Design a protein around this nucleic acid. Structure first.
Ligand SMILES: [Mg+2]
Ligand SMILES: [Mg+2]
Ligand SMILES: [Mg+2]
Lengths: 127, 41, 237, 85, 42, 53, 81, 285, 321
RNA sequence: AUUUGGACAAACUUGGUCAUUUAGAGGAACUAAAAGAAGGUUUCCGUAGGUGAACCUGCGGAAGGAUCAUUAAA
């Protein structure tokens, strides 16, 4: 009596995606971003915006029939930071409060065995 | 303003705890000065 | 940013009206695992109703934890991909498609002051499934060891790698895909590697890290039915 | 309590306690009240930059558009027929 | 200098407008009209 | 008003969202090579503001 | 002359921003339609259509299901709360 | 109550010279005639502008800081030269400047390059300009063909004017001292202006100064340059990628410049290259 | 058959026109293939007339001043002409025009109808061409006439054409494109009369002054510019909008101009001096549609939320008080 | 297609004649004018560049540049 989806959270430096799908992942149920929930660009990555997105997604899940989700949280990865930020942690807490069973939580950041050059240059970036 | 460069004895919860709840030390000396001035007089 | 202050974009001009809820036209489908796994029910998926439903369902890959499939947390750090091959009366019949570890378990195993030994082989089963195995092992220190580290000489590493490749090739070739899966679950391959490499160098955390399925034979419904262990309709009146 | 300035902008309230609406005053009474205030005021850094600019006449301001305007904010601007006629 | 004057003189024979030419800066990118008044007035 | 764990090349900063972004800029300036004395000066400017608000 | 002063009359949508189905009374006179987190009870009497009531929860939670009794005396609705 | 307008164009948020010899030397080298109207860029407090006001018919001062404009105003109120000064406040690059014979500038170095070409393109341009730039930028105006600092700016500016070094000003002569060295230079725009289209001259220079110390043939090897030139050839016909390749090859071979470096070429070599391209119908811009 | 239909909402409205023999009806070009017509409320209008002739959402809409003709531009690359049938008191599909490669984004009808029917139809499309279609003379068969040949086809712009405006005397028409330029075409030949290139962002609307030789254009640069058609130069630039200006119209003949912005505010300007007289704030979303009646005595604006504001001039009432 | 003549008649040029706004400079009236601080920037080497250059940038290298906490295990 427990139907499972997959809540795929993508916490970037400038935004947060909360994306629920079926177990296969080919089928989308609800995708909401923090930029759909705030009035200023500066706040799209905020923990506040990620909480509104997750509650918006959790309600749609309960309607469709999903009662549980597995969580696959990720950061940008690649040549950039590998750990999901505060926005992603905020969404995961919001889903837990929402009333959906949380099945299994995994970090699936794309980690290169080897990388191309990062965008900064020789002197660095992110002043 | 002086910025402390030593480890804070108060834990991160405490620094928020006290925020939930012109200076006493400045007034503490003021009492001491009055005591010293009164005794000297 | 949905505020009024946000500058108008070109793409806002003409937008389709939301006049149909997509989930009205979706149909749910049950996913069933091969008989090698103890817990056959692995959830359900949905697809647009046939106008066909089968075409979109076939080729669909679902990955699940072995702990769910076996009901034991000893397999919490291993995942199994299952690919839908046949659909019968809302039941999606799946077959082994791959296996992999969680990212946390791998990072847990990789530690400082020891040697990381990894081997891979491309080999085919007796059923003509071409697959690639990845094995990982680490050197360990002895009970009375006093050195801080447990590094192995490159001669040992090549010797251990040669032994592991010999074992991986032997097990896969002399077995079918279903039988190979039955070897992965009890981690019997790893114990075989441990025994063979015992006289070369002590090892720890010997695991078959990953399994890829590179090529597949012609699909045979009869073989799939047997792996899962026809139905007349009911007159409509 | 002490009587102060008029709360409304259309009235004069003195410290004597007497209020005077500008509408009810005759013209002669409005003149002396104007001169009475002048006596009271007579005996009684960016802004300093602004007034110096406004005081001088040979000053032209160029806005972001490149158009030429005076310190006041109005656009700064011989013919034989005009001078002869 | 005398060579400069000759070359400059010969250029005017081959001179054109440049509005349509793509700039080399692009190398990096790689009734009457007012009849309505008339009806209301009458 | 944050706490920082400097585990070899791995930096963890614990605090409120607006605060840990303030801490991150100072750490990034140090990594990019700004001398500690100059960084300590900027910290005083922001620290003064934090008490005001 | 110049046309500066203008007086406006607003026409809001009655039924929008929700998956809930509108309901009508048995006689067909009263129509209740959800608009986001608000409900518009509307009289359908010809020549005198008007908004009888405006119900606003203010909780921001949308209306999931909405039902008006056949006699029209009661309105029952459920929210996401 | 002018705060309304001046606050809408300025927000009311420099290295000041401290050597009178530099200020004096500039004005003497200008050689201002008594019938000359002078544009003065960067009046500062007014140390120089009073000196120009003494010997010039009229002086037009352009300033960017409202405070510095007021300081200029105070230094000339109720004086015989108050009637000869006109202060233009605000960004003077967008505005259309009046006619003037001489330009004496304590330039903000940020606007050095735009200014040098604003004067050159000024209709009826000034006959002499005494401009102060930084050493690195100044030396590129003064660079000769075959020098290391020869570049696009050197070739372009030398086609419309002649630039001559006057003196060097060190960082010590300013307070607070800047981190770069300064230099005072003379610019003389040519009258009559040479009858070469600015777009054609600059257009050719840009393609060939992408790598100044690389052969001219390689400059025309880039695909994007070929695409740009191919379209321009099409435009010429309107009033063929393989064809353009052959046309460029012949011009570079015949002029014997295809194996030369732009850093070691003078005006004539570019002019011969420009003319030869026109004969084959390739107009750069 | 359906006796009557109630409109819960009208979606997002792209354009509006006053239609019908008494001009009491309001035709809407929403994000729906159907042409909606609603009655102008007395100053709740639940009723709506839904006409279905198109296959995809309607980009734009135009109508003749009598109100008996409507032209609808659709995203299915076709344009329909509708005629009012007094017998049934409803509009009927009169003609269809099929020859465009991409969506038809703007459409235009004559401002002078002397034969009793409009004689041409101007259309613009995302294929970046403008076509002049002739409208057939009415025929008793009352069967839809499908036309696939246009009087001329001219390549107009490099980016999508956003608006099309027709002059009072049907001598010229203007197209506004998101390539930052407005072009004026001779209506009889399609020859490019002029190009008005001064804005810094792409243009959203263009409006001829129906009385004097003036043109107003609105851009994403938050400004409106008034152009002299004799000299083809900017006479005024109107600033004050916080966001992009999507609609602009002349009211009170030459005197005033009304504009709508993505910020949701409607401003009334004085064309002679170019300063904002009044700001109307009744909307909480962008305004794609703005229609006026009786030279700006009545103004209708439609929000993206689906809210109509009906503004009525009341100056003389205020002045008397 | 094209031609003659007869009315209708758009649109153009012109001097007038009417009505409406409207630019500078004068002349001469009336009314109004109740306020009162400080605050961005490691030092270089080789090489290559620079047209909003009081300095910027690409590549490789150096310290002649300020090491806290946890940490053997069980
Ligand atoms: Mg940042
Ligand atoms: Mg260097
Ligand atoms: Mg070395």
């Amino acid at each position: 009596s427990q139907v499972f989806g997959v809540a795929r959270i993508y916490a970037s430096f400038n935004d947060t995606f909360v994306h629920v799908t079926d177990l296969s992942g080919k089928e989308t149920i609800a995708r909401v971003t923090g930029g759909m929930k705030v009035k200023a660009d500066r706040d799209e990555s905020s923990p506040y915006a990620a909480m509104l997105a997750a509650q918006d997604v959790a309600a749609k899940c309960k309607e469709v029939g999903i009662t549980a989700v597995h969580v696959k949280i990720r950061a940008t990865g690649g040549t950039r930071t590998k750990t999901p930020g505060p926005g992603g942690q905020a969404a995961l807490r919001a889903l837990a409060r929402s009333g959906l069973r949380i099945g299994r939580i995994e970090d699936v950041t794309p980690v290169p065995s080897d990388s191309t050059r990062k965008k900064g240059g020789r002197r660095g970036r992110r002043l | 303003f002086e910025l402390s460069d030593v480890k804070s004895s108060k834990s991160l919860a405490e620094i928020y705890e006290d925020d939930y709840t012109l200076s006493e030390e400045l007034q503490k000396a003021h009492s001491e000065i009055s005591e010293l001035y009164a005794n000297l007089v | 940013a949905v505020g009024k202050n946000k500058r108008l974009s070109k793409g806002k001009k003409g937008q389709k009206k939301r006049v149909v809820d997509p989930f009205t036209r979706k149909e749910w489908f049950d996913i069933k695992a091969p008989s090698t796994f103890e817990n056959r029910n692995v959830g359900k998926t949905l697809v647009n109703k046939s106008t066909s439903a089968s075409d979109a369902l076939k080729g669909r890959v679902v990955e699940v934890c072995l702990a769910d499939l076996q009901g034991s947390e000893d397999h919490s750090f291993r995942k199994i991909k299952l690919r839908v091959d046949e659909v019968q009366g809302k039941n999606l019949l799946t077959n082994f498609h791959g296996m992999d570890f969680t990212t946390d378990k791998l990072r847990s195993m990789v530690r400082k002051w020891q040697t990381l030994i990894e081997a891979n082989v491309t080999v085919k089963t007796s059923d003509d499934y071409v697959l690639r195995i990845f094995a990982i092992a680490f050197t360990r220190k002895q009970a009375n060891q006093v050195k801080r580290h447990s590094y192995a000489q490159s001669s040992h590493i090549r010797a251990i790698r040669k032994v592991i490749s010999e074992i991986l090739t032997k097990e896969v070739q002399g077995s079918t895909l279903a039988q190979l899966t039955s070897k992965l679950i009890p981690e019997v391959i790893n114990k075989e590697i441990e025994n063979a490499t015992k006289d070369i160098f002590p090892l720890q955390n010997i695991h078959v890290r990953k399994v890829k399925l590179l090529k597949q034979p012609k699909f045979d419904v009869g073989a799939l039915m047997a792996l899962h262990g026809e139905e007349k309709g009911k007159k409509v009146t | 309590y002490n009587v102060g300035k008029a709360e409304k902008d259309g009235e004069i309230r003195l410290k004597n306690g007497v209020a005077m609406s500008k509408e009810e005053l005759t013209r002669e009474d409005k003149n002396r009240l104007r001169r009475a205030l002048k006596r009271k005021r007579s005996k009684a850094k960016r802004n300093d930059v602004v007034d110096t600019l406004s005081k001088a006449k040979n000053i032209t301001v160029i806005n972001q558009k490149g158009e030429k305007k005076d310190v006041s904010g109005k656009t700064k601007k011989p013919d034989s027929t005009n001078i002869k006629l | 200098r005398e060579e400069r004057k000759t070359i400059i003189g010969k250029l005017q024979d081959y001179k054109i407008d440049t509005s349509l030419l793509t700039s080399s800066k692009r190398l990096g990118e790689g009734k009457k009209y007012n009849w309505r008044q008339r009806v209301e007035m009458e | 008003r944050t706490r920082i764990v400097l585990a070899d090349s791995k930096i963890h900063i614990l605090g409120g969202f607006t605060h840990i972004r303030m801490a991150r800029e100072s750490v990034v300036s140090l990594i990019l090579g700004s001398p500690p004395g100059k960084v300590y000066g900027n910290l005083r400017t922001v620290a003064s503001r934090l008490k005001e608000r | 002359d110049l046309k500066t002063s203008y007086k406006g009359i607003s026409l809001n949508p009655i039924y929008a921003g929700s998956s809930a189905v509108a309901t009508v009374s048995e006689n067909g006179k009263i129509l209740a339609t959800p608009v986001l987190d608000e409900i518009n009870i509307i009289d359908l009497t010809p020549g005198s259509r008007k908004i009888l009531h405006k119900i606003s929860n203010e909780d921001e939670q949308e209306i999931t299901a909405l039902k008006l009794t056949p006699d029209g005396q009661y309105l029952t609705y459920v929210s996401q709360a | 109550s002018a705060e309304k307008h001046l606050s809408s164009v300025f927000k009311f948020n420099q290295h000041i010279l401290k050597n009178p010899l530099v200020a004096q030397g500039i004005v003497d080298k200008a050689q201002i005639r008594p019938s000359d109207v002078v544009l003065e860029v960067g009046p500062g407090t007014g140390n120089l502008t009073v000196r120009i006001l003494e010997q010039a018919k009229n002086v037009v001062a352009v300033e960017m800081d409202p405070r510095m404009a007021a300081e200029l105003t105070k230094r000339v109120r109720g004086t015989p030269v108050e009637k000869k000064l006109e202060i233009m406040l605000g960004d003077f690059m967008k505005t259309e400047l009046p006619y003037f014979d001489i330009c004496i500038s304590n330039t903000p170095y940020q606007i050095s390059s735009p200014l040098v070409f604003k004067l050159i393109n000024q209709p009826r341009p000034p006959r002499v300009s005494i401009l102060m730039f930084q050493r690195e930028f100044a030396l590129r105006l003064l660079a000769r063909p075959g020098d290391s600092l020869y570049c696009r700016l050197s070739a372009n500016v030398q086609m419309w004017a002649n630039v001559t070094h006057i003196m060097k000003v060190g960082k010590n002569n300013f307070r607070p001292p800047p981190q770069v060295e300064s230099s005072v230079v003379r610019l003389e725009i040519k009258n009559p202006r040479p009858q070469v289209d600015y777009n054609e001259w600059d257009g050719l220079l840009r393609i060939v100064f992408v790598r100044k110390n690389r052969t001219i043939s390689a400059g025309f090897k880039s695909t994007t340059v070929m695409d740009i030139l191919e379209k321009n050839y099409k435009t010429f016909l309107a009033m063929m990628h393989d064809v353009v390749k052959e046309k460029i090859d012949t011009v570079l071979k015949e002029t014997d410049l295809g194996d030369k470096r732009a850093g070691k070429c003078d005006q004539n070599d570019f002019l011969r290259l420009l003319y030869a391209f026109h004969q084959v119908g390739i107009h750069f811009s | 058959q359906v006796t009557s239909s109630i409109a819960g909402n009208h979606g997002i409205i792209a354009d509006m026109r006053y239609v019908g023999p008494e001009l009491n009806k309001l035709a809407l070009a929403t994000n729906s293939p159907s042409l909606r017509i609603i009655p102008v409320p007395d100053l709740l209008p639940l009723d709506v007339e839904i006409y279905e002739g198109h296959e995809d959402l309607l980009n734009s809409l135009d109508a003749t001043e009598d109100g008996l003709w409507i032209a609808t531009a659709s995203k299915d690359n076709t344009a329909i002409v509708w005629r009012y049938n007094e017998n049934s008191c409803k509009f009927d599909i009169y003609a269809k025009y099929i020859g465009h490669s991409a969506a038809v984004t703007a459409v235009g009808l004559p401002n002078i109808v002397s034969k009793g029917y409009p004689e041409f139809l101007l259309t613009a499309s995302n294929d970046l061409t403008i076509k002049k279609w002739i409208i057939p003379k009415p025929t008793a068969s009352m069967d839809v006439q499908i036309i696939k040949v246009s009087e001329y086809t001219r390549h107009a712009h490099e980016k999508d054409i956003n608006a099309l405006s027709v002059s009072p005397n049907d001598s010229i028409f203007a197209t506004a494109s998101y390539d930052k330029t407005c072009k004026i075409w001779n209506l009889e030949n399609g020859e490019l009369e002029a190009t008005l290139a001064n804005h810094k962002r792409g243009l959203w609307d263009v409006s001829f002054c129906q009385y004097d030789k003036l043109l107003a254009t609105s851009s994403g640069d938050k400004t409106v510019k008034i152009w002299s058609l004799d000299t083809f130069s900017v006479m005024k630039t109107l600033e004050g909008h916080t966001n992009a200006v999507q609609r602009c119209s002349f009211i009170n003949k030459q005197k005033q101009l009304i504009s709508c912005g993505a910020d949701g505010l409607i401003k009334i300007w004085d064309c002679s001096s170019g300063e904002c007289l009044k700001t109307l704030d009744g909307h909480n979303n962008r305004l794609w549609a703005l229609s006026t009646m009786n030279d700006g005595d009545m103004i209708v604006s439609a929000d993206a939320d689906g809210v109509f504001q009906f503004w009525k001039d009341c100056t003389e009432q205020e002045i008397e008080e």
